[PDB]
């Protein structure tokens, strides 16, 4: 038993996974993908969490995000836009939930990655451990 000396955090997204939710008819499929991180920061609540969220979660907590930024008075910390809606065809084919996934794991890095964040982000920690984020 160890304890890193320096604060960490490392965080992926991945996995991606298409469902069939009633598992008869096409109604309300969806992609969801898995976030894996790794940290100790005093702001988190265990070490590893693996949590997994479609692509309007990662909306819903943007713009959650984006107001707490605003409450915890950072006017000027700016959170860069996610990689983009689609059009409902293509939106399952492998290709496009590829480059999707590459999109979300690279914001999702780079938003973690933030020392304003890290530290004063109770959304954030919330997008990364809760089963479900809604």
């Known amino acids: 038993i160890y304890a890193e000396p320096e604060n960490f955090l490392e965080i992926e997204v991945h996995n991606p ?10 109604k309300g499929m969806f992609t969801d993908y898995e976030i894996i991180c790794r940290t100790n920061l005093p702001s988190f609540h265990k070490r590893v969490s693996k949590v997994r969220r479609r692509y309007s979660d990662f909306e ?6 984006i107001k707490e930024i605003s409450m915890l008075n950072h006017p000027k910390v700016m959170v860069p836009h996610l990689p983009g809606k689609i059009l409902l065809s ?7 939930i ?3 996934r590459q999109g979300l794991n690279t914001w999702m890095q780079s938003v973690a990655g933030h020392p304003l ?18």
Do not use: W, Y
Not at 60 to 65: A, D, N, P, Q, S
Not at 90 to 96: A, T, W, Y
Not at 117 to 134: M, N, P, T, Y
């Open 17 to 26: 996974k298409t469902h069939i939710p009633n598992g008869m008819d096409s």
């Open 60 to 65: 819903f907590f943007r713009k959650c995000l």
């Open 90 to 96: 293509n939106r399952f084919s492998n290709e496009v």
């Open 98 to 100: 590829e480059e999707r």
């Open 117 to 134: 964040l890290q530290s004063g982000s109770k959304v954030l920690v919330r997008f990364i451990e809760a089963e479900k984020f809604v």
